[PDB]
Structure 1
Amino acid sequence: VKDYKLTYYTPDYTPKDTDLLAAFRFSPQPGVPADEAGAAIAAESSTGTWTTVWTDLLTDMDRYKGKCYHIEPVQGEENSYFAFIAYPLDLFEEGSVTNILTSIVGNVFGFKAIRSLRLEDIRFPVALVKTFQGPPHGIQVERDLLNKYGRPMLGCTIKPKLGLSAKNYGRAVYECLRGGLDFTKDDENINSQPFQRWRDRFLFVADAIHKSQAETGEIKGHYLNVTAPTCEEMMKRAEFAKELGMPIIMHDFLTAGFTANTTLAKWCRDNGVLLHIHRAMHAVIDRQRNHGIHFRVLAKCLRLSGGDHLHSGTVVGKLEGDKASTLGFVDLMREDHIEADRSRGVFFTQDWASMPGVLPVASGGIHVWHMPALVEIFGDDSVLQFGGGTLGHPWGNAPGATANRVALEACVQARNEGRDLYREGGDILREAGKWSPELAAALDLWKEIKFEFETM
Structure 2
Amino acid sequence: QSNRYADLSLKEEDLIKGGNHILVAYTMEPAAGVGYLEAAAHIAAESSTGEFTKGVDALVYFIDEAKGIMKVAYPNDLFDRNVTDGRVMIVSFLTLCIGNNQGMGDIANLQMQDFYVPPRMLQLFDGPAKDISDLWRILGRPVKDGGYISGTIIKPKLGLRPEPFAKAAYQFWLGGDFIKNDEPQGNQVFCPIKKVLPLVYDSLKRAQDETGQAKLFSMNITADDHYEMCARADFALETFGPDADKVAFLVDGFVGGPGMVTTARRQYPSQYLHYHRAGHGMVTSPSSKRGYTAFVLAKMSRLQGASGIHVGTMGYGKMEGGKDDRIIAYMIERDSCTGPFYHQEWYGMKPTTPIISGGMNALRLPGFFENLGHGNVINTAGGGSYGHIDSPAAGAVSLRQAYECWKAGADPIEWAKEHKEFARAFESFPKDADKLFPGWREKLGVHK
Assess same fold via TM > 0.5: yes
Secondary structure, counterpart of 2:256 in structure 1: coil
Alpha-carbon distance in 2 for matches of 1:90, 1:329: 28
Indicate how the Cα distance of structure 1 residues 352 and 444 shifts in structure 2: closer, same or farther if over 3 A, else same.
same
1:130 deviation in Å? 0.4
| Offset at residue 292 of structure 1 (A) | 2.3
Residue 446 of structure 2 corresponds to residue 446 of structure 1? no
Matches of 1:22 and 1:293, distance apart in 2 = 11
Partner deviation per Cα, 1:150-183 (whole Å, 9 max, x = no partner) = 43111111143532221111111111101x2110
| Deviation (angstroms), 1:437 | 4.4
Instruction: Give the secondary structure class of the aligned counterpart of 1:375.
Output: helix
Given the alignment, which residue of 61, 65, 73 partners 1:69?
61
Q: Conserved in 2, the CA contact under 8 Å of 1:316 and 1:373? A: no
Q: Mark the CA change 1:322 to 1:242 in structure 2 (over 3 Å): closer, same or farther.
A: closer
In structure 1, distance between residues paired with 2:20 and 2:209: 52
> How far apart are residue 286 of structure 1 and its match?
1.8
Letter in 1 for 2:168: A
Show the counterpart of 1:342.
none
Q: Distance in 2 between matches of 1:24 and 1:283?
A: 18
Q: Is residue 2:237 matched to residue 1:242? A: yes
The normalised TM-score by structure 2 is: 0.86
Structure 1 residue identity aligned to 2:78? L
The match for 1:195 among 181, 190, 193 is 190
Residues 1:410 and 2:397 aligned together: no
CA contact (8 A) 1:182 1:220 kept: yes
The AA in structure 1 aligned to 2:358 is: G
- Size of the aligned set, in residue pairs, is 414
Compared with structure 1, are the counterparts of its residues 332 and 404 closer, same or farther at alpha carbon in structure 2 (3 Å cutoff)? Answer: closer
1:37 deviates by: 1.5
Q: Residue type matched to 2:284 in 1?
A: D
Counterpart in the other structure of 1:261: 261
Whole-Å Cα distance in 1 between the matches of residues 160 and 133 of structure 2? 36
Give 1:308's aligned residue: 307
Q: Which amino acid aligns with 2:53?
A: M
Q: Equivalent residue for 2:251?
A: 251
2:166 and 2:200 in contact (8 A); partners too: yes
**Counterpart-to-counterpart distance in 2, 1:30 and 1:161:** 46
1:334-345 correspondence to structure 2 within 5 Å: 334-339=333-338
1:316 offset after TM fit, Å? 4.0
**Alpha-carbon distance between aligned partners in 2 of 1:337 and 1:408, rounded to the nearest angstrom:** 26
Distance 1:390 1:35, change over 3 A: same
Report the CA distance between 1:396 and its aligned residue: 3.0
Check if 1:277 corresponds to 2:275.
yes
1:65 counterpart letter in structure 2: D
User: Tell me, what secondary structure is at the counterpart of 2:7?
Assistant: coil
Q: Do structure 1's residue 350 and structure 2's residue 344 form an aligned pair?
A: yes
Q: TM-score, normalised by structure 1?
A: 0.85
Report the residue type matching 2:192 in the other structure. R
Q: Which amino acid aligns with 1:28?
A: P
Give the match for residue 6 of structure 1.
Answer: 3
Q: 2:284 aligns with which of 281, 286, 311?
A: 286
Range with greater deviation from structure 2 (105-114 or 242-251)? 242-251
Distance in 1 (alpha carbons) for counterparts of 2:10 and 2:157: 58
Measured after TM superposition, the shift of residue 45 of structure 1 is: 0.7
Match of 2:366 in 1: 372
Return closer, same or farther for 1:61/1:392 CA change in 2, 3 Å cut-off: closer
Secondary structure of the structure 1 residue equivalent to 2:283 = coil
Q: Which residue of structure 2 lines up, in the alignment, with residue 112 of structure 1?
A: 105
Check 1:229–1:13 CA distance in 2 against 1; reply closer, same or farther (3 A cut).
closer
**Pairs within 5 Å for 1:172-187:** 172-178=168-174, 180-187=175-182
Q: Offset of 1:435 from its aligned partner?
A: 4.4
Residue of structure 2 aligned with 1:23, choices 25, 29, 43 = 25
Q: 1:322 to 1:260 in 2, by over 3 A?
A: closer
1:223–1:250 contact (8 Å) kept in structure 2: yes
Alpha-carbon distance change, 403 to 105 in structure 1, aligned in 2, over 3 angstroms: closer
Larger fraction in helix: 2
Q: 1:363 deviation in Å? A: 1.2
Match for 1:100: what amino acid? Answer: F
- Paired with 2:6 and 2:358, the residues of 1 have a C-alpha distance of 45
1:88 aligned partner, one-letter code = P
**8 A Cα contact 1:22 1:122, kept in partner:** yes
* Structure 1 residue 67: Cα displacement: 1.2
Q: 2:160 aligns with which of 164, 182, 189?
A: 164
Change (3 A) 1:130 1:146: farther
Instruction: Name the CA shift for 1:196/1:134 in 2 (closer, same or farther; >3 Å).
Output: same
1:37 aligned partner: 39
Q: CA deviation at 1:222?
A: 1.6
Between the aligned partners of 2:366 and 2:130, the Cα distance in structure 1 is 29
Deviates more, 1:403-412 or 1:224-233: 403-412
SS of aligned partner of 2:151: strand
Aligned counterparts of 1:161 and 1:137: Cα–Cα separation in 2 = 27
**Letter of the 2:161 counterpart:** S
Q: Distance in 2 between matches of 1:11 and 1:374?
A: 41
Q: Which amino acid aligns with 2:422?
A: L
Q: Secondary structure at the match of 1:6?
A: helix
Alignment check: 8 A CA contact 1:315 1:326 kept:
yes
Asked if the contact 1:202–1:224 (Cα under 8 Å) also holds between the matched residues in 2, the reply is no
Contact 2:250/2:276 (CA < 8 Å) preserved in 1?
Answer: yes
Deviations 1:258-312 (A, max 9, x none): 112112111222xx22111111111112223422211222212210111111100
Whole-Å separation in 1 of the counterparts to 2:362 and 2:132: 26
Asked if 1 retains the 8 angstrom alpha-carbon contact of 2:361 and 2:384, the reply is yes
Rounded Cα–Cα distance in structure 1 between residues aligned with 2:418 and 2:23: 57
Please tell me whether residue 155 in structure 1 is matched to residue 151 in structure 2: yes
Question: 1:316 and 1:160 mapped to 2: Cα distance?
Answer: 24
Alignment map for 1:64-103 (pairs within 5 Å): 64-75=56-67, 81-92=68-79, 93=81, 94-103=87-96
Counterpart Cα distance in 1 of 2:416 and 2:436: 21
Aligned CA distance change for structure 1 residues 220 and 95 (closer, same or farther; 3 Å): same
Calculate the aligned-residue CA RMSD, in Å: 2.4
Q: Identity of counterpart residues, as a percentage?
A: 30
1:204-215 to structure 2, matched below 5 A, reads 204-215=199-210
Equivalent residue for 2:414?
A: 431
Q: Is the 8 A contact 2:316 2:364 kept in 1?
A: no
- Superposed CA offset, 1:105-150 (max 9, x none): 2211111111111111111111011012211123434432433234
**How has the CA–CA distance of structure 1 residues 6 and 223 changed in structure 2, closer, same or farther, with 3 Å as cutoff?**
same
Aligned 8 A contact 2:226 2:260 in 1: yes
Equivalent residue letter for 1:68: V
Q: Aligned AA for 2:427? A: D
- Kindly indicate whether the alpha-carbon contact (under 8 Å) linking 1:28 and 1:115 is maintained by their aligned counterparts in 2: yes
Q: Residues 132, 146 of structure 1: CA spacing in aligned structure 2 closer, same or farther, 3 A cutoff?
A: farther
Q: How much has 1:438 moved relative to structure 2?
A: 3.6
1:386 to partner: Cα distance: 1.6
Tell which deviates more after alignment, 119-128 or 390-399: 390-399
